[PDB]
Amino acid sequence: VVIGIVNNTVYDPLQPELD
Amino acid sequence: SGWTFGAGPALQIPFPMQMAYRFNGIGVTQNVLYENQKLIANQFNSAIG
Ligand SMILES: *[C@@H]1O[C@H](CO)[C@@H](O)[C@H](O)[C@H]1NC(C)=O
Ligand SMILES: *[C@@H]1O[C@H](CO)[C@@H](O)[C@H](O)[C@H]1NC(C)=O
Q: What is the DSSP string of B1-49?
A: -TTGGGSSS-----HHHHHHHHHHHTT--THHHHHSHHHHHHHHHHHH-
A2 touches chain B (CB under 8 A): yes
The reply to whether ligand 2 has any atom less than 6 angstroms from the CB of A9 is no
Please tell me whether residue A8 adopts helix, strand or coil conformation.
Answer: coil
How far apart (Å, rounded) are the C-alpha atoms in residues B40 and B15? Answer: 13
Residue B30: other Cβ atoms inside 10 A: 15
The resolution, in Å, is 3.5
